[PDB]
């Protein structure tokens, strides 16, 4: 996997490749690693497919029960529920999760949760095996308060390079846009992003 989430002026955008791996065999070339845990709180999944799915399902359940009692949860709250599961079960989990959501008060927010189950609030986050190859690129190119089109290009160019060098990443580039306007899904095919 190669995944990332980037805050910008109007909110936050999540990005991911579509490759699932089983050794050197691609078990699924059209995977959806961007996952809804609430209307406008989503997550990027990396690591074990089974572990991250099981965690995401439990979080979605917790936030649905939260919403029934206390109304819309904050993005911080969602990240805290992810953390609790990842931290307390650190011995039995292989899950690198980026949590991203849109509040109207707090706007776009990104929390990354690495293997140990620590939480890190950042302007943008990158994760997955393919992220290693774009630390240099992303650090040099990220700016705060970018536009929607700029942020889409930033993610597209970043994941394009991650996919190019990482054998464990590939397929299509999926993206999910989180703003006050709503939820938009974007897809970008090899013929476009490869020749960037």
């Amino acid at each position: 996997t190669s995944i990332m989430a980037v805050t910008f002026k109007d909110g936050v955008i999540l990005g991911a490749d579509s490759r699932t791996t089983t050794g050197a065999y691609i078990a699924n070339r059209v995977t959806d690693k961007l996952t809804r845990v609430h209307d406008k709180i989503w997550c990027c999944r990396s690591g074990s497919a089974a572990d991250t799915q099981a965690i995401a399902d439990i979080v979605q359940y917790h936030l649905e029960l939260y919403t029934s009692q206390y109304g819309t949860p904050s993005t911080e709250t969602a990240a805290s529920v992810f953390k609790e599961l990842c931290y307390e079960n650190k011995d039995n989990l292989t899950a690198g999760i980026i949590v991203a959501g849109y509040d109207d008060k707090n706007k776009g927010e990104v929390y990354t949760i690495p293997l140990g189950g620590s939480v890190h609030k950042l302007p943008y986050a990158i994760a997955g095996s393919g992220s290693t190859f774009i630390y240099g690129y992303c650090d040099k190119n990220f700016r705060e308060n970018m536009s929607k089109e700029e942020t889409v290009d930033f993610i597209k160019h970043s994941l394009s390079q991650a996919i190019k060098w990482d054998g464990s990443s590939g397929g299509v580039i999926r993206m999910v846009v989180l703003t006050a306007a709503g939820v938009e899904r974007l897809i970008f095919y090899p013929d476009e992003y490869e020749q960037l």
Binding site: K33, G47, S48, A49
Partner: peptide, 4 residues
Amino acid sequence: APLX
């Protein structure tokens, strides 16, 4: 097992 499937990885991402």
